[PDB]
Structures are given as structure tokens and as C-alpha cells.
């Protein structure tokens, strides 16, 4: 009886840490608004109407959001799918051309600058012999002076032909659920005070992830998942100042953003079946597009993140907020996409505070670019068509991406600057709970039963 | 009975439990293991990967003493030098992932012992039927 | 289909008897009329409501047979 015999059990619940390819699955409600209005409304299996998470018992696994897989997979999938929604659309090959630009008709201030240049140019008609003279409106940030006369050109004339985005398809986010194939499972940590590294005490398996609205936001990540009860800061290594700090707070901050300039879409015929959508007349006043937050909720939430930031640096610490230090446009200013229109808004009015260890609304101006160089590819730029009417959007600032400055030489205070940097910092604020594990059945254990021959 | 509730004992629900708890529910975990323009190629690669794994496990079971059963006794004695822990503490206390990380060194030796015992059982069964 | 058969009382055989009694409340038709007269599609559309219950009964009977077989070998 003391001599035991081996037994193999198949279907034993035990998993290992693994790296596989999860498959996207959007909701069928977006298929109801059909005909290629966004990406993945036709290239995605429809969701399960009962996402079935199963709460476990007496179990503890160690997680790591920073060496995690499937954030890289989300990045690669969104980049490649973004590239895939440009091949049916039009290349602007006959548009990199000599542009005769003047000032826009406006009461000109010599100290300031007009942000619109009115450019007329030669364009080929649908017929190859006849060419026409057609005019349009652009911003300063898309044209440059080539070297009396004043002739301009597009800024991307010497790197790439800009694929015009299809005006049929839109850029609003829809929730994608990444579902694991058979043999794999997804574990989500339901602990409240979980800083995204180390053993989590209450995990639960699920077949598909929750709603991830994919936002394009460098600083001040939008439409995220709110924290449970308090502000939570997360980093891979706090004393590392080259590692970004993800701040996710509890109550959202409402932010309004608008362009008040009323624009006119005008079609120009490039060739047979080729349409170029330009800006026509500016109906009304020439104003600066901007955004608003509440003063009191911003001051309160900065007090909250100060209260949480003093847990990592001691109590007697002076915390100040200063603006971004410098770089390109979309890493020093916060950039986002308000319904197919790209704003680049100044965040100097927000990170301008100091904090000691004892009805109004902040408005901030923006710039508007039409051509973008998203993910900074070597030969891939993209024009964006103008859209009609006054454009406004309401969003919720959910978190921050901060960076501690290079403190040495007896630093009494510690300052924090905003900075977007890599886009993967945005996606790690949403896949921080989940991990992907491989189910390996067929365990083996001894018992006191030998097989009868 | 009117007024009838239900707990939906789903897939992968006996992780932290003891061995004898998971031994009842393992059948549904074995059942859920299978089913589940470039994106079709990715999902196809994932699906045929899943069936590659399932067929690998079915073949690895089949050369042992059981073809399609889920519980299987063999004729190889449990070497006490592997884990030297007796019946009650491994059948009542220990969890599964702990049991995985306790004997993750002698697994291949156990595989070879099972295969050799099954093959000599094959030749003994073929020779028992030789004299008939 | 192979996996759905395999958790039941037969692994790869095509004919399979089990230890679950046929509940007469399902169809209440005796042996001769269902073995000589009735067709297959008719038999499909006659008991297309209790099929999952039959699946669960087979699975529970096979699993308790597994634990009884494992306990029969316990004393040996």
C-alpha cells in the first residue's frame, strides 16, 4: 500500500505563461452601421453577447504589464490595419505642384500671423489635354516657401506621395475585444490596489477582453477606463526617470473641444474617378480652435495626483508641474482626433502649478494640421479631408503620461512634465489587467491503484 | 421544484482547489479545449495551431495505456525519489500549479517509463495470444 | 464529433451501449415501431428537444463509471 502507481489525468486545469496571437472581434452593433464607415466593421467576427468571466478561488499569479505580450500585438495590428484602410483611396500624385499662395482675406495684424494661406494652382482636369486653375485654403503647418514672387509647396513634396484618406471612412473608435483561441485563456486581475506588477490575489478568467476604445492621444489619454476608488500611479521603475509614469485617476475630467470656423467642402476633379476635397470659403469669423476644462475639477484632480505622488517620494516633497520641454509637434503638445479632424492643443495652461508639503474654465488654443505623419514612417504620409460645419466634441480626460526630470545635485523638489512618446503607453493603460496563458492538460500524479491486466 | 437556482460551473473553475476537487470537473475543461484579407490567415493559423496541439495531446495519450479515456492507471510504480510526498498531503492540500512546479524535472522520464511499460504490455499481450 | 463521442462510454467504436435507462417520458414509443417503421429524419424531428439532456446523462454516467472503476482498482 506504501508503493504508489502513476496515473495520467487529461484535462487537468493548469496553465503556463505564453505568447500567442489573439484574434480581434468587434461588436455586431457596428455592423448594423455598415458599408465600411470605419475599419473592422467588415473584417471582424461579431462578439459574444454574454462575455462570461469566471471568478476564481484561492489562486494567485504574478503579472507584469511592462514585459507583457499582446500590447505589441495590438500596436502591430492597429498599425497594419491603419495601413490597410488606405490602399483603395487616392494618391495625391498630381498635387505636389507649384502653389501660388496669398494671405487669406482677413484684417491682417502685422505682429501676429494669419494661420490660413489661400493658394491657387494649375491642376489637371479629367481630360489629359485641358488643365484648370483652381484655388483652396491651407494652414501654415502644411506648406513651405521655396526660393518678389511668393510661391509655396507642400511640406511632403520630398519624402512621399500623400495618400488622401477616403472621406467615406471615419476615424471614430469602436470597442474591439481581443479573444483568445481555443487552448488559451485570458486572466484579468480584479484586485483594487494592484499597481500592475507582482502577484495579484483575485484573478478571473474570461474568453474575451472588455471594451478597448482605441484612442490616438499623446498626452492626456482620452476615453479610458476609470480607476476604482482612488488615483493610481504606475511605473516599471520609479527611480528610473527614463520610464514614463502612467497616472489613472478615479473621477473623469470633462473636456470640450471645438473648431468654430465654418468651412466649405469643395471637390476638385483630379482625373477619372479621382476627387480631391479642399477647403472652400470660411463662412463667418476666422477664429482659433480651442478646448475647455473646468478650473475647479482640474485643480482638485491635480491635488489628488499630488496626494498620491507623495506616497513614492516621502511627505516633505515639493511637487511642481511644468510644460513639455521640446521636440516635435505631437510630443510636446497633446494631439487627438475629434471626428476625422486632428487637433494639436497647447497644454501649458494645465501643467503650471506648485504644491507644498503643508465657475471659470481653463481655455487652451490648438493648431489644426491636415497632413499627418502618423507613427513616423519613412514614406507614408496622409492628407485629411476638411469636414463641414462647426466641429465640437466632448471627451473625458482619464489619465496622464508623466516624466520626472533629471534630478541630481541635491534636488529638494521633483518636477513632472507631460510627454506622449511611444503610442504603446496608451495601450498599456488598457491591457494592464489581462495576461494570456496556455492551457496544458494531462497532468500526472500517483495513487494507490495498479492496472488489472 | 419551482424556485430552482443554478451555479454555472464554467470553463477553468478549479484552479486553486485541491486535486480531488478538480478531478470531477476536468471533463468540461477537456471539452472546452477544442472549439473556439490577412486576418483570416491569422485566425486560420491560430485555429490550426489549436488542432495541432489537440492532436499532439491525443497522439501522446494514445501510445500510452489509454486511447480516449480521461482517467488512466498503468503498471509503472511511482518512484519515491521524485517527490517523496504521501497520499493525503498531495490529494487534499496541494494545488495544481504547485504540483506542476514540484515535479517539472522528471516529466520526460515519466513519459518514457509509461511508453516502455505500454510497449512491453503490447508485446506481452501479443505473446499471450500467440499460444492461442 | 470524435471528442463528443470520446467523453462518453466509447472511444472509437461505432455502436455503443451505456448504463443510462431510456426515459419513457421522452418519446414513449416501443421497440418494434421505432426499429421497423420509423425513418431517420422522422426520428430526428421526434426527439430534437431532449438531446442535450441525453448528452448530460451520458456524460454523468460515464464519469461516475470512471470514478467507480478507479475505486475498484483502489483496493488492488
Amino acid at each position: 500500500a506504501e508503493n504508489l502507481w502513476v496515473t495520467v489525468y487529461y484535462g487537468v486545469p493548469v496553465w503556463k505563461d505564453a505568447e500567442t496571437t489573439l484574434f480581434c472581434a468587434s461588436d455586431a452593433k457596428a455592423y448594423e452601421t455598415e458599408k465600411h464607415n470605419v475599419w473592422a466593421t467588415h473584417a471582424c467576427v461579431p462578439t459574444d453577447p454574454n462575455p462570461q468571466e469566471i471568478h476564481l478561488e484561492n489562486v494567485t499569479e504574478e503579472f507584469n504589464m511592462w514585459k507583457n505580450n499582446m500590447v505589441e500585438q495590438m500596436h502591430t495590428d492597429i498599425i497594419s490595419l491603419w495601413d490597410q484602410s488606405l490602399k483603395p483611396c487616392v494618391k495625391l500624385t498630381p498635387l505636389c505642384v507649384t502653389l501660388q499662395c496669398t494671405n487669406v482675406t482677413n484684417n491682417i495684424t502685422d505682429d501676429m500671423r494669419g494661420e490660413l494661406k489661400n493658394c491657387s494652382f494649375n491642376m489637371t482636369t479629367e481630360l489629359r489635354d485641358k488643365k484648370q486653375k483652381v484655388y483652396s485654403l491651407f494652414y501654415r503647418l502644411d506648406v513651405v516657401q521655396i526660393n518678389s514672387n511668393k510661391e509655396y509647396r507642400l511640406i511632403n513634396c520630398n519624402t512621399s506621395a500623400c495618400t488622401q484618406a477616403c472621406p467615406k471612412v471615419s476615424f471614430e473608435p469602436i470597442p474591439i475585444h481581443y479573444c483568445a483561441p481555443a487552448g488559451f485563456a485570458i486572466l484579468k486581475c480584479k484586485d483594487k490596489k494592484f499597481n500592475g506588477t507582482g502577484p495579484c490575489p483575485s484573478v478571473s478568467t474570461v474568453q474575451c477582453t472588455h471594451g478597448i476604445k482605441p484612442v490616438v492621444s499623446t498626452q492626456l489619454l482620452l476615453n479610458g477606463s476609470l480607476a476604482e476608488e482612488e488615483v493610481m500611479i504606475r511605473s516599471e521603475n520609479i527611480t528610473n526617470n527614463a520610464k514614463n509614469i502612467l497616472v489613472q485617476f478615479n473621477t473623469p475630467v470633462q473636456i470640450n473641444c471645438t473648431r468654430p470656423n465654418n468651412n466649405t467642402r469643395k471637390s476638385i476633379r483630379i482625373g477619372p474617378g479621382q476627387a480631391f476635397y479642399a477647403t472652400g470659403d470660411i463662412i463667418g469669423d476666422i477664429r482659433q480652435a480651442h478646448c475647455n476644462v473646468s478650473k475647479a475639477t482640474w485643480n482638485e484632480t491635480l491635488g489628488k495626483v499630488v496626494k498620491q505622488l507623495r506616497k513614492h517620494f516621502g511627505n516633505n516633497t515639493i511637487i511642481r508641474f511644468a510644460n513639455s520641454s521640446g521636440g516635435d509637434l505631437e510630443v510636446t503638445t497633446h494631439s487627438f482626433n475629434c471626428g476625422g479632424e486632428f487637433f494639436y492643443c497647447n497644454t501649458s495652461g494645465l501643467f503650471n502649478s506648485t504644491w507644498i508639503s503643508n465657475n471659470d474654465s481653463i481655455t487652451l488654443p490648438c493648431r489644426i494640421k491636415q497632413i499627418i505623419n502618423m507613427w513616423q514612417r519613412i514614406g507614408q504620409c496622409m492628407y485629411a479631408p476638411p469636414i463641414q460645419g462647426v466641429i465640437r466634441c466632448v471627451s473625458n480626460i482619464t489619465g496622464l503620461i508623466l516624466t520626472r526630470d533629471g534630478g541630481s545635485t541635491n534636488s529638494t523638489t521633483e518636477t513632472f512634465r507631460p510627454g506622449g512618446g511611444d503610442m504603446r503607453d496608451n495601450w498599456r493603460s488598457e491591457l494592464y489587467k489581462y495576461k494570456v496563458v496556455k492551457i496544458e492538460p494531462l497532468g500526472v500524479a500517483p495513487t494507490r491503484c495498479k492496472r488489472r491486466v | 421544484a419551482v424556485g430552482i437556482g443554478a451555479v454555472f460551473l464554467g470553463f477553468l473553475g478549479a484552479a486553486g482547489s485541491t486535486m480531488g476537487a478538480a478531478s470531477m470537473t476536468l471533463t468540461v475543461q477537456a471539452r472546452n479545449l477544442l472549439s473556439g484579407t490577412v486576418w483570416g490567415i491569422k485566425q486560420l493559423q491560430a485555429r490550426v495551431l489549436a488542432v495541432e496541439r489537440y492532436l499532439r495531446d491525443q497522439q501522446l495519450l494514445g501510445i500510452w495505456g489509454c486511447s480516449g479515456k480521461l482517467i488512466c492507471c498503468t503498471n509503472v510504480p511511482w518512484n519515491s525519489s521524485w517527490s517523496n510526498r504521501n497520499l493525503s498531503e498531495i490529494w487534499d492540500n496541494m494545488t495544481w500549479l504547485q504540483w506542476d512546479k514540484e515535479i517539472s524535472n522528471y516529466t520526460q522520464i515519466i513519459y518514457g517509463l509509461l511508453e516502455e511499460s505500454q510497449n512491453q504490455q503490447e508485446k506481452n499481450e501479443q505473446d499471450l495470444l500467440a499460444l492461442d | 464529433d470524435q471528442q463528443l463521442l470520446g467523453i462518453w462510454g466509447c472511444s472509437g467504436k461505432l455502436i455503443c451501449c451505456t448504463n443510462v435507462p431510456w426515459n419513457s417520458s421522452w418519446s414513449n414509443r416501443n421497440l418494434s415501431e421505432i426499429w421497423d417503421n420509423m425513418t431517420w429524419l422522422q426520428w430526428d424531428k421526434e426527439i430534437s428537444n431532449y438531446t442535450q439532456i441525453i448528452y448530460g446523462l451520458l456524460e454523468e454516467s460515464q464519469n461516475q463509471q470512471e470514478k467507480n472503476e478507479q475505486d475498484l482498482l483502489a483496493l488492488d
Partner: antibody
């Protein structure tokens, strides 16, 4: 406290509202559902079921021997099963149990077992 | 409502006797009867569900027979942990009516 622990006031004034809460919990799945039930144990009579409600819906199923005088509510977020018995006389002096009502079935077809365990009660006296 | 009568109120037996508790119903509750064990002062815990199926956790001493309106719980080898009030529960139709109580001394 233990599972299905009933707490609240132990003395109810005459013809006021008895209001008791009970530590309930969610199931192992979001697909699960319980029926939480108030039962009283009287010295005079036996065990008497007071009422209850599904965890899925908000409909209340109760014993009409108390003549629809109960307000049976729940808060799954706050682990609350609540009885608000109204017009409480001394006949409702009893030890109240709150019970979980569910089945333990194993795989998606069959029934496999029912668990109707109770938690330790709280004596409520009306005078 | 469906009346449930449990008998006896109390039954006395020595250590190791097979005793029987008889639960009768007024109407058809065919196999919807539960058997519960309650320590004096403590909560009733489950013994038998569906009137013939042994619940996992309690021993094989608690067995159940009967059908329709009449059921009988059976205790083989009566134990000192069997000192408890037993209750048979109807769960066939609303409302839930339970037994009278059977004490073991």
C-alpha cells in the same frame, strides 16, 4: 462575517419596520444567479419562509401568509440582502435566517446537485 | 400552500440505531423534499436534496426513501453528532413550507 450572516437591529418597536441585512456574495460566474431567501424560525411554529428574490431580477417572491407586508431588496455591490417587514407585531419575534438558493450543476446540460445551505440566524424580538 | 407534517417531534435511541423520520405532504410534491440538520442555536445545514440523493459532504448514514406525498429519512448507526433538529422542506410550489422538527436524544 460568515457567508449569509444576517445583521441589523435585534429589537423592533411595535408596528414599525423590521429591517435586516445579510452578507451575500456574487457567484463564481456573472452567468450565475442566486435566490436569496428570508426564513424565520419561531418557537411556536416550525421554520417559516418569509420571502426572497432572484439575484438576476428585482421581482420579489414571498409567502402570502404575511400578506404582502414585506419589502425584499438587495444590493449585490454592497453584499446586502434586506428585509423590510412592515407593521411588525410580537408574532414576528423569531430567529431569522437568510439562505442562498442555487444548484451545483457541473456541465451545461444537466442538474448535478442543488445547494441550499443557510447562514446562522439573528433573533429579532418585537415588544 | 402545501402542508408538511414531520414525525416525530422527538425520537430516542441508543448509539448505533437505525432510526426513521417520516415526512408527509398534503399534495403531490413528488420528489421535491429536502432534509436539513440543525444544531440547537445554529443554522440548519443540508443533508438530503431531491429526497433520495445524498449531498456531498454528509456521510452515507443519512439515506432517504419514499415518493409522492410520503418520505422517510433513515439514519443507520446513529452518532453523537446526530443530536440535532431535522426538517423536511417542500420546494414544489410557492410558498416554501418546511417540517415540524425532529429532535434526536
Amino acid at each position: 462575517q460568515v457567508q449569509l450572516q444576517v445583521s441589523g437591529p435585534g429589537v423592533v418597536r411595535p408596528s414599525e419596520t423590521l429591517s435586516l441585512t445579510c452578507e451575500v456574495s456574487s457567484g463564481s460566474t456573472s452567468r450565475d444567479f442566486f435566490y436569496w431567501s428570508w426564513v424565520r424560525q419561531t418557537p411556536g411554529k416550525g421554520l417559516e419562509w418569509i420571502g426572497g428574490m432572484y439575484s438576476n431580477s428585482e421581482e420579489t417572491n414571498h409567502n402570502p401568509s404575511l400578506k404582502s407586508r414585506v419589502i425584499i431588496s438587495k444590493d449585490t455591490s454592497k453584499n446586502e440582502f434586506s428585509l423590510r417587514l412592515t407593521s411588525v407585531t410580537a408574532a414576528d419575534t423569531a430567529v431569522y435566517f437568510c439562505s442562498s438558493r442555487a444548484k451545483i450543476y457541473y456541465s451545461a446540460s444537466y442538474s448535478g446537485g442543488r445547494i441550499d445551505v443557510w447562514g446562522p440566524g439573528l433573533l429579532v424580538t418585537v415588544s | 400552500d402545501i402542508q408538511m407534517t414531520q414525525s416525530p417531534s422527538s425520537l430516542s435511541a441508543s448509539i448505533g440505531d437505525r432510526v426513521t423520520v417520516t415526512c408527509r405532504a398534503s399534495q403531490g410534491i413528488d420528489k421535491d423534499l429536502s432534509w436539513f440538520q440543525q444544531k440547537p442555536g445554529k443554522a440548519p445545514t443540508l443533508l438530503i436534496y431531491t429526497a433520495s440523493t445524498l449531498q456531498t459532504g454528509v456521510s452515507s448514514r443519512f439515506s432517504g426513501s419514499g415518493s409522492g406525498t410520503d418520505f422517510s429519512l433513515t439514519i443507520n448507526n446513529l452518532q453523537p453528532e446526530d443530536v440535532a433538529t431535522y426538517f423536511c422542506q417542500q420546494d414544489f410550489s410557492f410558498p416554501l413550507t418546511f417540517g415540524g422538527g425532529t429532535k434526536v436524544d
